[PDB]
Scaffold this active site. Sequence first.
Site, PDB file in Angstrom:
ATOM      1  N   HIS B  46       0.811  -1.203   0.000  1.00 10.09           N
ATOM      2  CA  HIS B  46       0.000   0.000   0.000  1.00 10.09           C
ATOM      3  C   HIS B  46       0.849   1.259   0.000  1.00 10.09           C
ATOM      4  CE1 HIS B  46      -2.981  -2.412   2.667  1.00 10.09           C
ATOM      5  NE2 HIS B  46      -3.193  -2.698   1.393  1.00 10.09           N
ATOM      6  N   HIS B  48       0.578   4.631   1.795  1.00 10.36           N
ATOM      7  CA  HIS B  48      -0.037   5.306   2.916  1.00 10.36           C
ATOM      8  C   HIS B  48       0.233   6.806   2.825  1.00 10.36           C
ATOM      9  CE1 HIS B  48      -1.417   1.963   5.666  1.00 10.36           C
ATOM     10  NE2 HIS B  48      -0.878   1.289   4.673  1.00 10.36           N
ATOM     11  N   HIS B  63      -4.445   4.494   4.265  1.00  6.01           N
ATOM     12  CA  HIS B  63      -4.215   4.365   2.827  1.00  6.01           C
ATOM     13  C   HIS B  63      -4.349   5.719   2.141  1.00  6.01           C
ATOM     14  CE1 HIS B  63      -5.544  -0.115   2.814  1.00  6.01           C
ATOM     15  NE2 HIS B  63      -4.795   0.203   3.854  1.00  6.01           N
ATOM     16  N   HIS B  71     -11.988   0.971  -0.002  1.00  4.96           N
ATOM     17  CA  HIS B  71     -10.846   0.114  -0.325  1.00  4.96           C
ATOM     18  C   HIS B  71     -11.247  -0.958  -1.351  1.00  4.96           C
ATOM     19  CE1 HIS B  71      -7.101  -1.997   0.334  1.00  4.96           C
ATOM     20  NE2 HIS B  71      -7.803  -3.124   0.325  1.00  4.96           N
ATOM     21  N   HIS B  80      -8.839   2.896  -3.348  1.00  3.59           N
ATOM     22  CA  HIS B  80      -7.965   3.991  -2.946  1.00  3.59           C
ATOM     23  C   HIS B  80      -6.824   4.147  -3.945  1.00  3.59           C
ATOM     24  CE1 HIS B  80      -9.181   2.639   1.366  1.00  3.59           C
ATOM     25  NE2 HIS B  80     -10.067   3.495   0.873  1.00  3.59           N
ATOM     26  N   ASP B  83      -3.985   1.605  -3.220  1.00  5.13           N
ATOM     27  CA  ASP B  83      -4.253   0.143  -3.247  1.00  5.13           C
ATOM     28  C   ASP B  83      -3.539  -0.585  -4.397  1.00  5.13           C
ATOM     29  OD1 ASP B  83      -5.868   0.575  -1.076  1.00  5.13           O
ATOM     30  OD2 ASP B  83      -7.773   0.505  -2.186  1.00  5.13           O
ATOM     31  N   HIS B 120       2.857  -5.526   4.173  1.00  6.43           N
ATOM     32  CA  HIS B 120       2.047  -6.028   5.278  1.00  6.43           C
ATOM     33  C   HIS B 120       2.255  -7.492   5.623  1.00  6.43           C
ATOM     34  CE1 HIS B 120      -0.715  -2.806   6.379  1.00  6.43           C
ATOM     35  NE2 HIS B 120      -0.429  -2.304   5.201  1.00  6.43           N
ATOM     36  N   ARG B 143       2.003  -3.699   9.748  1.00  8.38           N
ATOM     37  CA  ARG B 143       2.872  -3.030   8.805  1.00  8.38           C
ATOM     38  C   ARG B 143       4.286  -3.521   9.104  1.00  8.38           C
ATOM     39  NH1 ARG B 143       0.245   3.100   9.384  1.00  8.38           N
ATOM     40  NH2 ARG B 143      -1.909   2.376   8.973  1.00  8.38           N
TER      41      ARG B 143
HETATM   42 CU   LIG Z   1      -1.056  -0.721   3.782  1.00  5.41          CU
HETATM   43 ZN   LIG Z   2      -7.023   0.877   0.509  1.00  9.19          ZN
END
Ligand SMILES: [Cu+2]
Ligand SMILES: [Zn+2]
Lengths: 153, 153
Positions: B46, B48, B63, B71, B80, B83, B120, B143
Site C-alpha cells: 500500500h 499510505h 491508505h 478500499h 484507494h 491500493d 504487510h 505493517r
Molecule cells: Cu497498507
Molecule cells: Zn485501501
Amino acid sequence: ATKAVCVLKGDGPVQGIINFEQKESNGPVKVWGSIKGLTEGLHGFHVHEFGDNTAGCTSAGPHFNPLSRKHGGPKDEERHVGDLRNVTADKDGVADVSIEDSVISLSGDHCIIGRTLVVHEKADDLGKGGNEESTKTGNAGSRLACGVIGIAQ
Amino acid sequence: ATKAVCVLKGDGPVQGIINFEQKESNGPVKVWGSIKGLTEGLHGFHVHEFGDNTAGCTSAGPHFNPLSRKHGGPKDEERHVGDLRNVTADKDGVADVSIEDSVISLSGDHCIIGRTLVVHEKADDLGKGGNEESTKTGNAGSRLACGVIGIAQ
Ligand SMILES: [Cu+2]
Ligand SMILES: [Zn+2]
Ligand SMILES: [Zn+2]
Ligand SMILES: [Zn+2]
C-alpha cells in the site's frame, strides 16, 4: 499551511528528527527539531537532490540546485536551494535546530519533499574556504546521517 | 520521464527496495524491485498517506485516498489511490515485484512522492473479505516495513 518531516539515520550513532512547516505558498519555511550523537561544533546541513537511500547517504546525489547556482549559505540568491549552512552541536553532541529559510519550499520548483536531508561530519565552509570545492560543496566531509523528506499531517 | 525509489525497513527482518518509473504525465507507473524476509505467500502492498517515520510505520497514516473511495483491488474502479497489487514471496522469503499501476502517479493529484510505501503481514483481501473492515483496509495485518517514496535519478 503545509508540513513535512524527516528522520535522519546513518551507519553510526547520529540520529535526529527534523520538522518543516510552510504557512504560505512561496513563503518562509520553519525548520526545527534535534540531532544527537554529533561531535561538538559546526556540522554541514544540506538538502541533497535525490530521495534515494539505496546506498545509504551516498545515493542522495549532489546538493539540490534547481537554479544552477554556486554553493553558499548566508545569501538567499547566492547558494544552492539545498544549502542550509550548519547545525551546531553543543558540548553534549546535541544540535537544537531552529531556523527559518526563505529559499527551500514545500511546493513548487524549490520543493524539497521527496529529497534527502543530510548532516555532515565537518563544518560547511559556506563557500569561503578558498578553494574550488568550497564553491561546489562547502567541504563538509562525510555524510553521517540522512533521511528522505516526507509529507506530514 | 520521472523516477522514484523507496527503501523499506522496519523493526524486524523485512526489508526491500522498490523503484517507480513513469514515462508520461498521468501515464502508467512501473513498480519493480525486491522485498526479503517475508513469509511465503501474499502480502499487502500500500501507499499510505504520510511520509512520516517518526513512530515507525505507524505514523504513515491511512491508505492514500484523496478521492474518498472505499478500499478495493488495484483493478477496480472503486479503490484507494494507494491500493496496489499484493506482492508474493517465494519459499525463501523473497518477493521479486514487477507491476504496473495506472492510478498512482509521480506528479499531480495522485502524486505519491513524499508518501510511504508499506508491506504487510498478510494478504490484502481486495475488499472481498467477509467483514466491514475489508472495504476500509483489506485486512492485511501489521505493517512489517515501510519507507518514504523519494525522487530518483
Ligand atoms: Cu497498507
Ligand atoms: Zn485501501
Ligand atoms: Zn552535503
Ligand atoms: Zn550547496
